Structure formats: C-alpha cells, structure tokens
C-alpha cells in the first residue's frame, strides 16, 4: 500500500514534515491525496482533503503539497495537542482507495512515564509458563513507544502492548506483557523494558537473580 | 450537527457474522456516499468500500468481496455493514465515514473525503469460550500488585483489602492476546514502612465465568 514513515519527531514551536509516497497510479496522477490525524482511541479526523485542501476548523498550520509521487503534510506551529498518529489516504482508479502504513508524530520536549517493570512470580513458573509485566502511567500526551528486551537483543517474540488509556487526571497509562516460556528466564543474564516517550526514555530492568 | 451513531461492540465466533449499524443524522442521507473503514488494535486503518445511500450501489476492495455485504435503510437514515465468515485477525474497530456528495457533475465513489466519522464499534473474534482467569502476585515506597491472567469475556473488577483502600490503585485496561484470551493488571503505591506490617490482598471477580479470588502479596 501507501509507505509512510513510522516515526517523525518535532519539538513545540513549528516546522515538520511526513510523507507519503505512493505509485504512478495514484499520487502522481490524482488530486485525491487526504490527510487524518488520529488521537488514542478516538476516530481519525480530516486534517486535510484533496492534497492541499482544509476542512472547516483546522487550522492554518497544517497544509499539504505533492512533487509527482510523493504526498508532504507539514504541521507549521507544532503544538503537544498535535502528537497523535498521522494516515495518508489515497485514491488508486478503478473504484478503490487506499491507506498509509501510519506515521506516529511526537513532540520532544515537556508529562513523562512512570514506568514499573514486574518479573515472572514464583507462581506461574510453576504453572510452565512466564510473564513480563511493563506498567506505564501518568504520560501526556498519550503516545508512547515501548521496546523489550533479553540482555541486549530486541525480543519481539509475543509481546501486546496496550493503547493509551485516558485516566482521571486527562494523563495516559499503557501496559506490555512480554509472554515466554521459563526456560528463555532462567537462561538470559536479563530483560529490560524501554518505554521511549518523547525523545526521553525510560528504562526498567529485571533478572532471575 | 451532522453526527454517525453506531452500535456498541459485539464479540462473535470465528465462522459466523457480524452486523454493524451506521445512524447519521444532520443532512440528507441520500446524498453523500457513505465509506466503511476498520483498524486492529495497534495496527493502521483499512478501507472496506463504500455505499450509495440512494441506490444502494456498493464496491469493495478485492479481498472483502465475497464476506461484505452493505445495505441500507433511508427511513431511519442508517447504513448497515455486514462481515461474513469471521477470522480471528477481523478483530477490530469498524468505522462508518462519510464521504463526497453525490451529483452528477463528476466523482464515482473515488474522493476519500471522510469529513465526519463515527465512534467506532469494536468487534471481537476469537476462540469463545468462558473462562475465569488465573491471578498471580506481584511482589516488590514501593508498588505491588496482581497479574490477572487468561480469563474470557471482558470485564474483571479488582479491589485490595475488600476495598480498605484506593490510594495508589491502578487498574490497567485489559490486553487481548493472540490467543482470543485477556489479561490485566492491578498495581498499587504504599510505603516501605508498611511491609511486614499490612497484609495486602486484592480481590478479583470475573462474573462471566463466576470467579471471586482473593489473593495475597508478600516480598
């Protein structure tokens, strides 16, 4: 489909930029490029329609241009409201539409984790089985990236991580649990969670001792 | 105010089929087309076709045709969309979006203008069968709490000390693994002076499944 970056990285003030880049049969050959922006589970908004196009409401400070087969949408007046996931939206002939993969926007600068990692009780190595437990709470704004891992290799392997979740003080929570059999416990030195919020990251450690 | 409505949120086996209702109410419904779309949980959005509120003439992407089926009733002014044949990975938000006018200057379906959108209704497949959960502690100011594992359908509640406290409490929202099986966890802030000291215990209930637990954390 639509290739967007996964990440893009601005700091309050203004100036930015995501992309998206599409084939000759869409892009390069329409002007049906929109723009949605998506705050944590909420639905997608129309930040921008027809390439280069603002709706009612949106302000001045997003806008979009294209150069043949590439989308830009650039937020000018960066702001910690603007972190949120941005979609590239295309329309590619023959009656069909298509999505971008998904560009998650954060704002480096000011609300951070309260990371609290938790290893696998005494218990549940003895029901044959193991889980890590990454507990984050109290972030604003609500996007968080969270990475694991044995000694000093990215796991990957099963690791569910939650979406932000609006509490009672407007701040956000996500929670990950890595899932491994004991064996991967007793054997690795350690794990560590990494919940990277906005360009600071905090990082949580844990070993079988 | 043009606003969508849908329904609220159904889990279903894997091999039946879901029904979702689209309410939209501020305009003529018969004149704007009407564009479904979905996401997974953690995953991106997803374009399921569109639907002419007048003629009812629909199209869908190529790997839909077949399970999707959208209908319409102008009456009551709601867009209906059906998924056939559920897979575990159809677990996901389902949006109604509405999309460009209908006229007949220019535009088929086309123009993804998705203006206003709806709240979203969650369908979740998976292997359905009730289950209570297996809780486990979680041991250590200092934080301590339980792991509430594996359990079938949503919700759990959680407590501590029958409800003696609610200082430092934190429910998280559960997470749905690949298993079709949730879990979630309770965690909760006390002072380092206080072990040895208090007895901490929370207590479970996963009425789907009947399960009251009461279980206990020490170091």
């Known amino acids: 489909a639509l290739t967007q970056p996964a990440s893009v990285s601005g700091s309050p003030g203004q100036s930015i930029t995501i992309s998206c880049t599409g084939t000759s049969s869409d892009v390069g050959s329409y002007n049906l490029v929109s723009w949605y922006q998506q705050h944590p589970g909420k639905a997608p908004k129309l930040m921008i329609y027809?390439?280069?196009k603002r709706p009612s409401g949106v302000s001045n400070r997003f806008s979009g241009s294209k150069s043949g087969n590439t989308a830009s949408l650039t937020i000018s007046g960066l702001q910690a409201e603007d972190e949120a996931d941005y979609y590239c939206?295309?329309?590619?002939?023959?009656?069909?539409?298509?999505f971008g993969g998904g560009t998650k926007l954060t704002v480096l600068g000011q609300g951070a984790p309260s990371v609290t990692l938790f290893p696998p009780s005494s218990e549940e190595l003895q029901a044959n089985k193991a889980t890590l437990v990454c507990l984050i709470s109290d972030f604003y704004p609500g996007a968080v990236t969270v990475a694991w891992k044995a000694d000093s290799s990215p796991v990957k392997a099963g690791v569910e991580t939650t979406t932000p979740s609006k509490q009672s003080n407007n701040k956000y929570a996500a929670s990950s649990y890595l899932s491994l059999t004991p064996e991967q416990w007793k054997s690795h030195r350690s794990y560590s969670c990494q919940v990277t919020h906005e360009g600071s990251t905090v990082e949580k450690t844990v070993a079988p001792t | 105010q043009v606003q969508l409505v849908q329904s609220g949120a159904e889990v279903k086996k894997p091999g039946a089929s879901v029904k979702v209702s689209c309410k939209a109410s501020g305009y003529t419904f018969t004149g704007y087309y009407m564009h479904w779309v979905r996401q997974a949980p953690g995953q991106g959005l997803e374009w399921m076709g569109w639907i002419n509120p007048n003629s009812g003439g629909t199209n869908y992407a190529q790997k839909f045709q077949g399970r999707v089926t959208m209908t319409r009733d102008t009456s009551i002014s709601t867009a209906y969309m059906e998924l056939s044949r559920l897979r575990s990975d159809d677990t996901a938000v389902y949006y109604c979006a509405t999309g460009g006018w209908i006229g007949l200057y220019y535009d088929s379906s086309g123009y993804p203008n998705f203006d206003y959108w709806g709240q979203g209704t969650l369908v979740t497949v998976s292997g359905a069968s009730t289950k209570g959960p297996s809780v486990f502690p979680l041991a250590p100011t200092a934080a301590l709490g339980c792991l509430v594992k594996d359990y079938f359908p949503e919700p759990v509640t959680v407590s501590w000390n029958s409800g003696a406290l609610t200082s430092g409490v934190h429910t998280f929202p559960a997470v749905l693994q690949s298993s079709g099986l949730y879990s979630l966890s309770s965690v909760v802030t006390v002072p380092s002076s206080s072990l040895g000291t208090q007895t901490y215990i929370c207590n479970v209930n996963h009425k789907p499944s009947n399960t009251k637990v009461d279980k206990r954390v020490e170091p």
């Open positions: 027809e390439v280069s």
């Open positions: 939206c295309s329309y590619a002939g023959s009656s069909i539409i298509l």
